[PDB]
Design goal:
Pfam family, one (chain E): Ribosomal_L34
Shape of chain A: globular
Organism (chain E): Vibrio natriegens NBRC 15636 = ATCC 14048 = DSM 759
Protein name (chain E): Large ribosomal subunit protein bL34
Number of strands of chain D: 5
Number of helices of chain A: 4
Radius of gyration of chain A: 15 Å
Largest interface: C-D, 8 and 10 residues
Number of helices of chain D: 3
Helix content of chain A: 40-55%
GO molecular function (chain E): structural constituent of ribosome
Order of helices and strands of chain D: EHHHEEEE
InterPro entries (chain E): Ribosomal_bL34 (IPR000271), Ribosomal_bL34_CS (IPR020939)
Distance between the termini of chain A: 44 Å
Distance between the termini of chain D: 7 Å
Strand content of chain A: 15-25%
Oligomer: part of a larger assembly
Helix content of chain D: 25-40%
Largest sheet of chain D: 3 strands, antiparallel
Strand order of the largest sheet of chain D: 1-5-2
Radius of gyration of chain D: 17 Å
Structural class of chain D: alpha+beta
Strand content of chain D: 25-35%
Structural class of chain A: alpha+beta
Number of strands of chain A: 3
Chains: A alpha+beta, B mainly alpha, C alpha+beta, D alpha+beta, E mainly alpha
Shape of chain D: elongated
Chain lengths: ~120, ~120, ~55, ~110, ~45
Amino acid sequence: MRHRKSGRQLNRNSSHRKAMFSNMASSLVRHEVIKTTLPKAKELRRVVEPLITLAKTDSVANRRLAFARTRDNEVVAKLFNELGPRFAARQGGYTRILKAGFRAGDKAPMAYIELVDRPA
Amino acid sequence: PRVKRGVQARARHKKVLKQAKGYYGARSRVYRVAFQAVTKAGQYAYRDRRAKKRQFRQLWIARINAASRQNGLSYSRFINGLKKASIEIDRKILADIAVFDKAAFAVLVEKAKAAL
Amino acid sequence: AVQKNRKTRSKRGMRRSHDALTTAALSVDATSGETHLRHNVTAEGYYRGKKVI
Amino acid sequence: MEAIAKHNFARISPQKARLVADQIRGKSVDQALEILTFSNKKAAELVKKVLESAIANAEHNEGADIDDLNVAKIFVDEGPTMKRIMPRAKGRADRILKRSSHITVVVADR
Amino acid sequence: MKRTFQPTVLKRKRTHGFRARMATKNGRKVINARRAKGRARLSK
RNA sequence: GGUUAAGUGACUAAGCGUACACGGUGGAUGCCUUGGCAGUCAGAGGCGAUGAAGGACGUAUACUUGCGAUAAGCCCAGA
RNA sequence: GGGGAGUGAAAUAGAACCUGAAACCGUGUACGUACAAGCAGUAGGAGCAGGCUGUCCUGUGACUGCGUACCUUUUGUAU
RNA sequence: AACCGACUAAUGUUGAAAAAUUAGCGGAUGACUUGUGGCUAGGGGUGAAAGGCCAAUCAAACCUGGAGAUAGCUGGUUCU
RNA sequence: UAACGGGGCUAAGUAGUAAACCGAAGCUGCGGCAAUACUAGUAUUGGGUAGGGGAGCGUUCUGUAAGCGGUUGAAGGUGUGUGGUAACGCAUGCUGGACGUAUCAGAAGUGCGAAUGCUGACAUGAGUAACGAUAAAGGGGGUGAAAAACCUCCUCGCCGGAAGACCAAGGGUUCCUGUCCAACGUUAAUCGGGGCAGGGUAAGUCGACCCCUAAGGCGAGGCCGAAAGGCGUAGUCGAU
């Protein structure tokens, strides 16, 4: 029935989804703009935007939390050194999804997702 | 000598197919179904050439009855009247008169009434 | 399990009466004048008049 | 002025291609081109190539302008079928038909 | 599952080879038959 | 003329049918035949250790045909 | 893959190649068809559309009557 | 455990598979199991015996021939 | 409903009387055809399975025919018109591009809807099921006409007494490189065990060959057997 339920299965196990989103967040922090399928973009917001919020308060605790959720030291550094400071004032909506047609191979609805206020 | 059947075989099939123009589906396209169809059409056509003669006479009688009863006589009494008056106008004509010359029909009815 | 009578072309056609395709919602970008799927970026990277890619 | 492009022996089922042909039949060339551009159909890409060849043919082989052009006639005809064999279970083999299609587009300034 | 054809070359030759066919009367009958039929391959 | 009422009622075709036109597919038919079939009259009625039948592998500036390290040939005589 | 150009007597003789049937699949046009029940026709029949010029021809066929394929095998088959 | 096997169930039954998969199951230094090569051949072989097996075939293999066996049976049998 | 065919009926029921009418491919009328008798007319007759009998149509081939028709368009194909009781005939537009064939005879591989017929083609189911282990992907970049699938980088996951590395067998160029992407590849493919071309396999010591023999095979003479052969000595082969 799925009444009032949240979270897409994305035709995946939980452990896979968790892995996939951890990866995808790392990619988005690293490149600041990522092309994915639109449903994955929409889910990614629920993963990335909380990491950015965490990164607004710099602490050994919070860095370790971010590390736990990303397992990437380059990402954690960029989060706490760059992205947190950037989005300090901003109250949510750190990312932006731009729909971008279909993928050639499977005509999957695709979208760009990017950080807001990219210096580029 | 060896005889190939093609050219004549096709002509037979085509003859039937041409007779089955206008039938639905297979019955106009496919020889096996068309043949059956063209046969039953011939059967019906034989039966109906007979039954046409019955249907038309029923129609006339129905019309003559209408007209006679408008002129105050039953079909059954009108035919007897005419017979007794020695009037030998067919139902096909009577029914034509009942439609196209209502006055004449009334005359015939008046003649019929007198004979009864 | 299986048909007892081959289906006519008519009835086959009747089934495919709903098989027709519908077109995409398009729009034209203000700046680039490029047609695009409405709500989607253009091929040149515009969305609602701004270069976003 | 008429120009006709054909794509003979196109690897696409006529039934599939015909759905896209139905989308652009009677349409202007500019309108047809956008309809095919934002199609997700394989058929739309084959058909778009034919339509473009037809437009080219009218501009070059005739004297015409893309502006004054309509999909005058479009049709897909059954091409030859490559037969192939698919193994099924219990040693049974089924035939696969690889249908092909002949796509014809005609464009006309009228 | 183990299927019936479990080839070894040696067993193919010793059974169906030319020198095997030629060794026996009835084998030679086979070679002659195949040679008469026009068979490109007389032996395995 | 308008309003109202009553009666009546075309114009829809998602699709489908029939007919026609023009096509596609397909490869029938017709015409054709460098192949067969049945004979007649002749020939020759065997080939093989002087290594056959049939092959393998080669051979010219893949396969078929020919040839055999003298390898699509060498010699000789006629034509 | 095609369109021109060119070749050819012919290119819907263009190598997927003489002729090019049927099944089967399309596009176009006319007519019918969304209150109507069944071997799909038949006898009748309005309307519409083309011709020809309306007691004509062609196509379609609202509506009405009638009407349970074929073969085989059987005492007997819509079966 | 490997390896050999095949007791139960579910799936599968136009299979992934003309006998399997998954979970369990038996044997597991022996009358064990396995490779290579040998031998036995059709009223014949071989069988710790099920008419089992002898190339996905077995109360008499497969191929070719007799051979167009025979078929008081079934089907079918073509223009007016 | 469902024991009038229905509606419905108190007569539209039942019995009767009178005079009507409807009603069949019956009878009659009118036109036509045929069979058989008779003398062209009469008269009778013309449902039909198994089956008997009679008369024909058309096809291929031979003569007729070195004739006749044909590139000024044959056969075949496809329309149309027309004729006959029918099989079918004739004419003709278009297509087609070289044969056809009167008449009268002659001879048959002489007529197909069926045989769970045979061969090919093409339908229906249906754009349906499925796309072959639920070990799993995500992203950046590249090349390209095009990238979910190829290359590359960073992450993730899976096997690890194997899903790694070797060898024998078996296969046979699948190996490597360049190139191509039609078909093949259950999608696409720039990729491939696919196509195409070129290249690549180096031994005193590995293996084979070789020496040796096992089971067993063959087997000079031999023994035995209608023939074919069987068995077997000396031998000679035969690896695992």
